Write a protein that binds this ligand. Structure first.
Ligand SMILES: NC(=O)C1=CN([C@@H]2O[C@H](COP(=O)(O)OP(=O)(O)OC[C@H]3O[C@@H](n4cnc5c(N)ncnc54)[C@H](OP(=O)(O)O)[C@@H]3O)[C@@H](O)[C@H]2O)C=CC1
Ligand SMILES: NC(=O)C1=CN([C@@H]2O[C@H](COP(=O)(O)OP(=O)(O)OC[C@H]3O[C@@H](n4cnc5c(N)ncnc54)[C@H](OP(=O)(O)O)[C@@H]3O)[C@@H](O)[C@H]2O)C=CC1
Ligand SMILES: CCc1nc(N)nc(N)c1OCCCOc1ccccc1/C=C1\CCOC1=O
Ligand SMILES: CCc1nc(N)nc(N)c1OCCCOc1ccccc1/C=C1\CCOC1=O
Ligand SMILES: O=c1ccn([C@H]2C[C@H](O)[C@@H](COP(=O)(O)O)O2)c(=O)[nH]1
Ligand SMILES: O=c1ccn([C@H]2C[C@H](O)[C@@H](COP(=O)(O)O)O2)c(=O)[nH]1
Lengths: 528, 532
């Protein structure tokens, strides 16, 4: 029997990044305080979380805890003759709390001090001289759970003395000056078991993770009727998590589903795939920018491609001269000839995305022609519908021009975008007919999330949801080993995207107008 | 105080078919499914999935939960506190109908009610009882998990009348057979449906399974992660039946649950019509066409028009008169002089709908002139192309049929709501995704599901494939305000097992179907609803 298990002693903390290709690990989030106070001004949502966790009590479960504690102390009663949690603090910590919040409401307040005396305190608020006097006080109290609230000294000694059953760890994804830090967590001592959704509060993203020390028959009946070379230990870390609420799991769960249940199919490359048909993912752009964190991703190229689209260009050389090689293989002489485009100049990609967005229906000649005022300017049309008729159900942008497919270097994977406006907020669905989960889809989420921001800003709206509909969704067999590595990495809180606020027209964006902030990521993975 | 059926966990399990009586404008209720047996045996040759279910339910035990049951029954009786098995009780006629190679039923304690036979007349390991009261006595002496009454009709009736049944596990066999004995009519005041299963096909019939009921560290962590969960003027009891159900696995709940979500959480918006809506953005529904045809059952739907509309599409027609002459009025309001003038289509003849679905499917990119023109070999015949892709390049990820022709939208009576179909082929089976930009949940979506489920069958058949999944992606999904009260009624109806769709197998080209090549079979449905 362990003391922390008998007396249910937990730690709860909130750590930021600290002012120093930077490498990342859990120890990236370690900033606790600065000059006796919190490193940040105010992060309300963590405050609300901290209070919610340290005040919550379950009466109907206390008798099992009381029974266990008395058995361990060779007693029949807590006596030895309104349930609340206990919260333990350091003196410096208790001094940093403003007066009007002390003692903490609905909690048994305990202060570890070597200089304070209980006479100038109340009797509700206890003072104890060392760690051992806590265990004595807990054995004499009725309480639900015991939360170590810090600070840095208290965390360290409790952690080395193995008195912590779980750590409730808030990751504050921003950087502050700090002089005190959470002690490094030994991953052979604790491991992450649950990760929350990602949130925005007071101009920072944050999430919540949990470290752990290392009728109903009718349901069965309805399951009376309930594959690929993938082994248990392959996804040990992935399957060991209990709560996977981070939105990155929307992408990772789809990969897991394809690996476990996908259909074996052949492809042009001869690599072969596992495929499934029909998925949705939803990302809340008001709370985070969903740039994958379980590997490193770069954004300059996909931003340039998007600016290239908006200009309505079809000339692959424009990208190539900026060393954006997304379309290079699709514009070679051999690739075009295999498309039977024998009279197409190298890197002339034909009436692809940008041409369809600005000139749908115009006759394509070559990438140097002047198409001004030719065909339908869809992009201008949708921006005008969003501004002037926001409840239209016809706000769609379509790249799948059936008449021009064979003239394109290849037909679009991103068939269409539809927009939706409510209470000054813009959402976007993108339908993708063909989804390379390992390589393409991480970039695709970023492209159309950025696009949704761009459209929202030029329409004086706030982005809300990017909604990604996947058609033929596949994992190439040569990515399977790399994706096994990636599925067993635990996501970090997402970054944020900042657009130059001065840009008010869709055509005025330049590469320098986009900034990714606070991107914390695992190391790059060559998909192979 | 405590009821006998509660102490001893006495359940009924049965399978009921429809019974020959049939007519047009037939009314349906729970009592529609009441056929138990014919001439002392079952009315059907063999429905194996029900047999599998019946075996799983009546053989399943949970050892962990026995100790609580053992204490409960000891307390009731004033008693002191091989493998666990269930008890199964059969009437003598029921026992005699089971082939010998299955008797006594495996892994279960067998009990037979009889007066004309005594234990000496049986070779098998079975208990004979001659009164219901003796079963209760026997149950007090045995160690067992649950007690299931297996019929026949006499046994069912007397155990219901004695109020000895705690739950009825009831299979609805959605086909008609000759019957001479019948499950008793169930009292809605005495028993209510609490769970409904997925719909299945077994041995050329659909069926589902319903249940009538008699009328820790990580646990706290879950509370923690919900710390930030904090609308529309809809009352609780308005969805009393809908929220009473425990398990809603019938595939019709994919539609019903979306309606509920829009009513509870939808956004109040204006719209092009002026009625106003509640709306949400982005849903997916999946229907398994190998197991059922998803024609909604919580209200009456007709399919003749949408089939004729689909055949009109495939012919490439844009002439609304063609449908009107078949007394199909789906497109009538979009073809009037007034409607076309408001579309600024002043030079368009009445009922000339312009370059809409049919024209885009057979002639995408051709210049539209009028509904009477000869368009042969003009534009892209994408319907022909995707059939050829499905036959000759089935792994292609480019098998896509698109009605949203951006150049032609303003020439259309109205822009298409069904933007595109993508197809997927694996293991000789065809699946279809349809993307719908705008979805009238009350009136349009029920018909749209049916239309594209039929189209998936037609494309599957002419490509010698079997239909697998119809997948329906909703973009702007809305409920019109004038539909809300109709939908409140409908959401409190329990779905029936789905019908089946059958096609003339001789039709081998997509263009060769006629209205008489389609048969919907065993459509059981609630009353038609006027959405108002
Ligand atoms: N972000 C977060 O999650 C949290 C951050 N903080 C920040 O942390 C900082 C303070 O942490 P820190 O500076 O380490 O000070 P602490 O909060 O660790 O308290 C330290 C004091 O507590 C007393 N104490 C500590 N250990 C013992 C012991 N074993 N027996 C008796 N008395 C003991 C001593 O006071 P004496 O001199 O009487 O011995 C010591 O000086 C502040 O800036 C605060 O804002 C605080 C709480 C949570
Ligand atoms: N589809 C389904 O779910 C099921 C269908 N069936 C069908 O049901 C039909 C048979 O049902 P049914 O005809 O009603 O006959 P039952 O199976 O109900 O058994 C009736 C006989 O059981 C004995 N019995 C019943 N109650 C008592 C009692 N209280 N005390 C003593 N003996 C009793 C008597 O046998 P005796 O004459 O020896 O006294 C009575 O004649 C068959 O067609 C069978 O295939 C059967 C089970 C389930
Ligand atoms: C940063 C919040 C927090 N977060 C998590 N996850 N763990 C913690 N150990 C933690 O610190 C709580 C103890 C310290 O608390 C305060 C410290 C400084 C100022 C105010 C407070 C508390 C307040 C103010 C309003 O109401 C309170 O209770
Ligand atoms: C239709 C089955 C059934 N279905 C549900 N839902 N409820 C029931 N009360 C039920 O009857 C089971 C008792 C009678 O059973 C048989 C009757 C005729 C022939 C065979 C059997 C039993 C067999 C054969 C295979 O193994 C068996 O047990
Ligand atoms: O932006 C893109 C472009 C391509 N792909 C992937 C999907 C397929 O693996 C392949 C497209 O080839 P086809 O589906 O046309 O065969 O590229 C993406 O995921 N995103
Ligand atoms: O097959 C159809 C055709 C139309 N609608 C509905 C959706 C909208 O309520 C209305 C079309 O209006 P707009 O989206 O074009 O405004 O008709 C459907 O649900 N299904």
């Amino acid at each position: 029997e362990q003391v922390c298990d008998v007396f249910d002693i937990y730690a709860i903390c909130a750590c930021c990044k600290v002012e120093s290709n930077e490498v990342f690990n859990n120890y990236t989030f370690r900033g606790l305080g600065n000059k006796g106070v919190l490193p940040w001004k105010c992060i309300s949502l963590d405050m609300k979380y901290f209070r919610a966790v340290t005040t919550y009590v379950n009466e109907s479960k206390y008798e099992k805890l009381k029974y266990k504690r008395c058995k361990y102390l060779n007693k029949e009663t807590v006596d030895n003759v309104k349930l609340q949690n206990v919260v333990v603090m350091g003196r410096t910590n208790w001094e940093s709390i403003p007066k009007k919040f002390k003692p903490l409401s609905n909690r048994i307040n305990v202060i570890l001090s070597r200089t304070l005396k209980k006479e100038d305190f109340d009797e509700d608020v206890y003072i104890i001289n060392k760690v051992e006097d806590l265990i004595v006080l807990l054995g004499k109290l009725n309480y639900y759970k015991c939360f170590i609230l810090g600070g840095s000294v208290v965390y360290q000694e409790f952690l080395e003395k193995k008195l912590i059953k779980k750590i409730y760890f808030t990751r504050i994804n921003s950087t502050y000056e700090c002089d005190v830090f959470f002690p490094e967590i030994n991953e052979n001592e604790y491991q992450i078991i649950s990760v929350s959704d990602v949130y925005t509060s007071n101009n920072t993203t944050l999430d919540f993770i949990i470290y752990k020390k290392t009728e109903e028959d009718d349901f069965v009946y309805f399951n009376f009727n309930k594959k690929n070379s993938i082994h248990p230990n392959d996804f040990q870390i992935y399957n060991s998590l209990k709560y996977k609420y981070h939105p990155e799991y929307q992408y990772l769960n789809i990969i897991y589903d394809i690996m476990m249940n996908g259909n074996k199919q052949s492809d042009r490359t001869g690599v072969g795939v596992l495929s499934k048909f029909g998925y949705i993912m939803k990302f809340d752009l008001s709370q985070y920018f969903p740039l994958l964190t379980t590997k490193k991703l770069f954004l300059r190229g996909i931003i340039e491609e998007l600016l290239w689209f908006i200009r309505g260009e079809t000339n692959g050389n424009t990208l190539l001269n900026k060393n954006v090689r997304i379309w290079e293989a699709n514009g070679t002489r051999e690739f075009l000839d295999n498309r039977k485009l024998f009279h197409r100049e190298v890197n002339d990609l034909g009436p692809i995305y940008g041409f369809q967005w600005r000139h749908f229906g115009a006759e394509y000649t070559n990438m140097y022609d002047n198409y001004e005022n030719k065909g339908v300017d869809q992009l201008k049309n949708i921006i005008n519908l969003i501004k002037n008729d926001p409840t239209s159900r016809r706000i769609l942008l379509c790249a799948w021009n059936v008449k021009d497919l064979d003239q394109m270097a290849l037909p679009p994977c991103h068939i269409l975008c539809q927009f939706y406006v409510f209470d000054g907020k813009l959402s976007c669905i993108m339908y993708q007919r063909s989804c390379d989960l390992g390589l393409g889809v991480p970039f695709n989420i970023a492209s159309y999330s950025i696009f949704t921001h761009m459209i929202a800003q030029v329409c004086n709206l706030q982005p809300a949801q990017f909604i990604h509909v996947l058609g033929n969704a596949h994992v190439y067999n040569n990515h399977i080993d790399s994706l096994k590595i990636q599925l067993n990495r635990i996501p970090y809180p997402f970054p944020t995207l900042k657009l130059n606020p001065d840009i008010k027209n869709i055509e005025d964006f330049t590469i320098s107008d986009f900034t990714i902030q606070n991107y914390v990521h695992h190391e790059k993975i060559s998909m192979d």
